[PDB]
Design a protein around this ligand. Structure first.
Ligand SMILES: *C(=O)[C@H](C[C@@H]1CCNC1=O)NC(=O)[C@H](CC1CCCCC1)NC(=O)c1cc2ccccc2[nH]1
Ligand SMILES: *C(=O)[C@H](C[C@@H]1CCNC1=O)NC(=O)[C@H](CC1CCCCC1)NC(=O)c1cc2ccccc2[nH]1
Lengths: 301, 301
């Protein structure tokens, strides 16, 4: 009954959020075991934002130049090290609330939950998708950096995103938990175009499937199409080209709903070529593509 | 930077979710101090769903007929009591993770976060609004009952909703934490019309304000209107009539944005009378009314 954007319970990740101060810069860090991960641009003072030599800047910082607080507790930093665009502060105490976790680099088009924090304390949680251009359409203010994106499976938390900066278009760029930026972005104060924002076609089809599951069926047609046929009438609308894997990924949904995959593409083709006509699908007046096929199966169990 | 539906961190509420079994019925309960709150329709067997005499049904249940589990821990039920449509099982142990909390009955149009659970374990979290007709547009399946809605302020958790049933239209009805249903709904298996779904006009205006804050300004006009004038050209579209309080509530936003409240109404009037014209506002193709003015100020700090 019903369907909306649902983030994972943020409890397993709150117990890992801490405050990190390095000069005038304050932001958030992730405390797992006896290490604290944070964006390396903490060490950057104001006049080091255009082109900062992080090696040179880090050579001037010592362990005591990094103050970490897990609430009122102050963790002693006993060893720092820069890994890609991320810093690894080794604290003397291990987080007793460290959950079963693993660092993973999500693929473009996969969803994850974000826990926007400020000054170490969590502020809110919301679902995000790794756009095809490698940006995320998040909600971040100053001090938001260090906030992580994650997926929760069973008892294992898969961290996949740490916020770093915003782009000139309002969307955001970040890094995986190993320090490598998603996309071609770099942690320098310079204008960085994000690239054309494509639409995750597989997710859209996945979203139409929960529609039919929930009783929204006005978009279903007596039509069908071919895979190549659909991609030609979908590239005009900047849609990710549908592959055979995408078809297979939608297999479980197609098999459950009794609606063939290519029949959905035919229903999607008519939506791109004719619009919504003021109708609505799962409460939305546009085509949603931040619901991955796997997100649908779990919410529509 | 950016703006989307953001729920409160669900950590303070996960430590209070437990499993409740009474016969073939299994659902979720809220464990605060030495009491567990759950919907009274646990005691209802299948053939007691049309018109159940809860007094009669509860007279046949004993303390041992209620099994409560907080994960692998089994809490002993030492005293049960029905309060309105909610049961209060007194367990022998107090929840060590009980947060500072209070039970509150939210007003129609206020938002709250929901933590949909199943078999006692949390599944996800999402933002909801108490619709004017007293329903909520949630996402619930079988076994979802007992899931709570809450707002988090500082360290205090204000529980305001416990899910009970779905309506014939896909929307959901529930109770406050004192057992009283929101709206005229009752916990019986019978068709219950929800009433016309009005639009929280104050929230819509609030949502347009974050728009202008975030750089979406195409909807702003050289026009203005009068309070009575706007309400007449808004009742046709089933919009909550704007009051002077609503105006005052939007004062902080209006004063910050340099846009008078009635000027926003004029911009809203043209949107209702002319549509979106394919444009978009904060990523939405329709007018959003589940962002309360207070939700905007905290997300746009
Ligand atoms: C983290 O704390 C913030 C998050 C930002 C604030 C507004 N919304 C966000 O997503 N990150 C920043 O402010 C970075 C900090 C820089 C420090 C030096 C190294 C590079 C990152 N800056 C930006 O996000 C930034 C700079 C900039 C310049 C020109 C266009 C866009 C732009 N974004
Ligand atoms: C809680 O576990 C579920 C939540 C439902 C399941 C589907 N989505 C939901 O929101 N609650 C129910 O299934 C209730 C249980 C009844 C037990 C006996 C007392 C009344 C509640 N039933 C309904 O939600 C229900 C019955 C019904 C009959 C006719 C139209 C709608 C309708 N909804």
């Amino acid at each position: 009954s019903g369907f909306r954007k649902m983030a994972f319970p943020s409890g397993k990740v709150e117990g890992c959020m801490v405050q990190v101060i390095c000069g005038t810069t304050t932001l958030n860090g992730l405390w797992l075991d006896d290490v604290v991960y944070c964006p390396r641009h903490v060490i950057c003072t104001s006049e080091d934002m255009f082109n900062p030599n992080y090696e040179d800047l880090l050579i001037r910082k010592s362990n005591h130049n990094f103050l970490v607080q897990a609430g009122n507790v102050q963790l002693r930093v006993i060893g720092h090290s820069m890994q890609n665009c991320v810093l690894k502060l080794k604290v003397d105490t291990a987080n007793p609330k460290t959950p079963k976790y693993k660092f993973v680099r999500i693929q473009p088009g996969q969803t994850f939950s974000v826990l926007a924090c400020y000054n170490g304390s969590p502020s809110g949680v919301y679902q995000c998708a790794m756009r095809p251009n490698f940006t995320i359409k998040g909600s971040f203010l100053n001090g938001s950096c260090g906030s992580v994106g994650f997926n929760i499976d069973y008892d294992c938390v898969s961290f996949c995103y740490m916020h770093h900066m915003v782009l000139p278009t309002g969307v955001h760029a970040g890094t995986d938990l190993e320090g490598n930026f998603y996309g071609p972005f770099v942690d320098r104060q310079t204008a960085q175009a994000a690239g054309t924002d494509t639409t995750i076609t597989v997710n859209v089809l996945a979203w139409l499937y929960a529609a039919v599951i929930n009783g929204d069926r006005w978009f279903l047609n007596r039509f069908t199409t071919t895979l190549n046929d659909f991609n030609l009438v979908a590239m005009k609308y900047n849609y990710e080209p549908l592959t055979q894997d995408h078809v297979d990924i939608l297999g479980p949904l197609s098999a459950q709903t009794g609606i063939a995959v290519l029949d959905m593409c035919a229903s999607l083709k008519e939506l791109l070529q004719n619009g919504m006509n003021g109708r609505t699908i799962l409460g939305s007046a546009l085509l949603e593509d931040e619901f991955t096929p796997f997100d649908v199966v779990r919410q529509c169990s």
